[PDB]
Ligand binder design. Structure first.
Ligand SMILES: Cc1c(NCc2ccccc2-c2ccccc2)cnn(C)c1=O
Length: 127
């Protein structure tokens, strides 16, 4: 069994910025979700070998996880907040597409998404 390489977290030729909106996405949004009791399944890429999910990467073609998002925020990978917000939404959507309603992993994603939506609702205006 085989995992794909993780998503890119470093690219010297990709343009990037340090902005108050991206600082908020690390300091408020990522920090809030990361410390949550249901964060652990989302803190690293889905390991299809260890989890015995040989079909995972047949169904999910844009993998994303909070470990990758945390690295992208800490290593200033992003140009804007929308790029980072899309990564969170990709992570949640992948969970809902692969799994079934009421599955433990879906209940965990739903709890994290509720907090995500609450925090993004108060995304500050650009300075
Ligand atoms: C389908 C799927 C996963 N499957 C396993 C799982 C399921 C529920 C809770 C926890 C884990 C887990 C987490 C880490 C290690 C071992 C099991 C796990 N994560 N995601 C995002 C999934 O979609």
């Amino acid at each position: 069994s085989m995992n794909p390489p993780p998503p890119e977290t470093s690219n010297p030729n990709k343009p990037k910025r340090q902005t108050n909106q991206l600082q908020y996405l690390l300091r408020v949004v990522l920090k809030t979700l990361w410390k949550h009791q249901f964060a652990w399944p989302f803190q690293q890429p889905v390991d299809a070998v260890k989890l015995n999910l040989p079909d995972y990467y047949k169904i999910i073609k844009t993998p994303m996880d909070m470990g990758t998002i945390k690295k992208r925020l800490e290593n200033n990978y992003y140009w804007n907040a929308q790029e980072c917000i899309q990564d969170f939404n990709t992570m949640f959507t992948n969970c809902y597409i692969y799994n079934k309603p009421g599955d433990d992993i879906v209940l965990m994603a739903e709890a994290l998404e509720k907090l995500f939506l609450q925090k993004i609702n108060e995304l500050p205006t650009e300075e």
